[PDB]
Design an enzyme around this catalytic site. Structure first.
Site, short mmCIF file in Angstrom:
data_model
loop_
_atom_site.label_atom_id
_atom_site.label_comp_id
_atom_site.label_asym_id
_atom_site.label_seq_id
_atom_site.Cartn_x
_atom_site.Cartn_y
_atom_site.Cartn_z
N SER A 125 0.87 -1.18 0.00
CA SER A 125 0.00 0.00 0.00
C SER A 125 0.90 1.23 0.00
O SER A 125 2.08 1.13 0.38
CB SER A 125 -0.84 0.00 1.30
OG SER A 125 -1.56 1.21 1.47
N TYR A 138 -4.57 -0.87 9.66
CA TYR A 138 -4.11 -1.08 8.30
C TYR A 138 -2.68 -0.57 8.10
O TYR A 138 -1.83 -1.27 7.54
CB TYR A 138 -5.07 -0.39 7.34
CG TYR A 138 -4.80 -0.62 5.89
CD1 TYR A 138 -5.15 -1.83 5.27
CD2 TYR A 138 -4.22 0.37 5.11
CE1 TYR A 138 -4.91 -2.03 3.91
CE2 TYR A 138 -3.98 0.18 3.77
CZ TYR A 138 -4.33 -1.02 3.17
OH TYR A 138 -4.08 -1.18 1.83
#
Length: 242
Positions: A125, A138
């Site tokens: 990410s 996350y």
């Protein structure tokens, strides 16, 4: 030549896009590990597993014990919103279990199933690099993946096994659409208005399609990228450049 690939979370989003691209060559066999099967092909094997459960992963490992892999794509993952104060312990654990542990259990278990010269790719990410508000669990998980990438690259280099991580900006996936829909409903704006706000976060002024991320994954799995290892590869529409 015949090649084998393993994809965790291969039934949706980037994982599905990678699976479809890998299946295009009939000498490729792809094994998709996910909670629900997606589409079918004679050269696609599906094994159902809840990737938060070690026992499910142990069961998969037994099934695939004779298979030697050329490539692995780790796309299991979830995002649960909240700052550290707003997300509960149980949810933090769920995010770590799926995003980090599922890959640990698999790679550890595939020690004798990785070919010399194999390529392992993580779905990271832009949050391997930076943080975004109210995304604690996350971001935490992607930091762990970022460094796991480098550790594995160092320790597997003796076997010419490459390990890299794609670092996508926002991607138009089911999970993305779900979060943004629930956000839209919560603040009283339309889905379109919400997506437009998100698009403006990126210099390119758009979000990615899953196929776009999959092309990079395919490049990293291919024989064209043998000197790349230990890398976090931005594919984020300029997000981390600003």
């Amino acid at each position: 030549a015949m090649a084998n690939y393993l994809v965790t979370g291969g039934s949706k989003g980037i994982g599905k896009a990678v699976v479809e691209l890998l299946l295009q060559n009939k000498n490729h066999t792809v094994i998709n590990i996910d909670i629900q099967q997606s589409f079918s092909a004679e050269n696609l094997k599906f094994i159902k597993a809840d990737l938060t459960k070690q026992q499910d992963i142990t069961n998969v490992l037994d099934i695939i014990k004779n298979v030697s892999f050329d490539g692995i794509f780790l796309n299991a993952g979830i995002l649960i919103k909240g700052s550290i104060f707003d997300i509960d312990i149980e949810s933090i654990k769920k995010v770590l279990d799926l995003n980090v542990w599922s890959s640990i259990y698999f790679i550890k278990g595939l020690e004798n199933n990785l070919k010399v010269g194999a390529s392992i790719v993580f779905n990271g990410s832009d949050q391997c690099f930076i943080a975004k508000p109210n995304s604690f669990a996350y971001t935490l998980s992607k930091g762990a993946i970022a460094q796991m990438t480098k550790s594995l690259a160092l320790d597997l280099a003796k076997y010419q096994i490459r390990v890299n991580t794609v670092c996508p900006g926002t991607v138009d996936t089911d999970l993305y659409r779900n979060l943004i829909q629930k956000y839209a409903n919560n603040v009283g704006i339309s889905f379109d208005e919400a997506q437009k706000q998100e698009e403006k976060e990126f210099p390119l002024n758009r979000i990615a399609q899953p196929q776009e991320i999959a092309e990079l994954v395919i490049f990293l799995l291919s024989d064209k990228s043998k000197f790349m290892t230990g890398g976090l590869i931005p594919i984020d529409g300029g997000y981390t450049a600003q």
